[PDB]
Amino acid sequence: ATSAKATQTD
Amino acid sequence: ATSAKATQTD
Amino acid sequence: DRKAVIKNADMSEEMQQDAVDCATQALEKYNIEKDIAAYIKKEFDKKYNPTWHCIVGRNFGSYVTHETRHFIYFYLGQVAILLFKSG
Amino acid sequence: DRKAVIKNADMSEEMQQDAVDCATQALEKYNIEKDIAAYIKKEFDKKYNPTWHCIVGRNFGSYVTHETRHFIYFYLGQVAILLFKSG
Numbered sequence: 185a186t187s188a189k190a191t192q193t194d
Numbered sequence: 195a196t197s198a199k200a201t202q203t204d
Numbered sequence: 205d206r207k208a209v210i211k212n213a214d215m216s217e218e219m220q221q222d223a224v225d226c227a228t229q230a231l232e233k234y235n236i237e238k239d240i241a242a243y244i245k246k247e248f249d250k251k252y253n254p255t256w257h258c259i260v261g262r263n264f265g266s267y268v269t270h271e272t273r274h275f276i277y278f279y280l281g282q283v284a285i286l287l288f289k290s291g
Numbered sequence: 292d293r294k295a296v297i298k299n300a301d302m303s304e305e306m307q308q309d310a311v312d313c314a315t316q317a318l319e320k321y322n323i324e325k326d327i328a329a330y331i332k333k334e335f336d337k338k339y340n341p342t343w344h345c346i347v348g349r350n351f352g353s354y355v356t357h358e359t360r361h362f363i364y365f366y367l368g369q370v371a372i373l374l375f376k377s378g
Binding site for chain 3: 329377
């Protein structure tokens, strides 16, 4: 039901 | 049980 | 005015457009990142039910857990917007 | 090396120190903000149970909802770290 996400500004 | 928080970098 | 570039999304196309619309309204109304974030968050809590979290800025990395179909990470102009539901 | 300045916290003093320790380890190991964030998040999920979210950067504003006693916002050097439990 859930996932993990990584984000990074460029 | 929950609260809302605002944060801002200086 | 500002260019919407969607970077990563786990979200219906309908809601993606809503996110971009909301952030555009937020950037029209507010200048400070925490205020922009708060506007977007509260409107999604209102429209799509709690619990959303919003990050707005030019320099940040993140690692979060979201409910499937409730995640978007996008640029609107030179600011990045992370918006996701968890809780 | 780097100076820990706690800005806003809703968290036991014990766990606040754990947060600062974790971020110091993260900054020792990683250079990229998303990797630093991921290290801190996963360790808190491990130690204090899901579900934590971590933001690391020099420029961001946020508006999030957290479970009481599970929120910390702090600087470690020139980087800001937001760490909170929701879900």
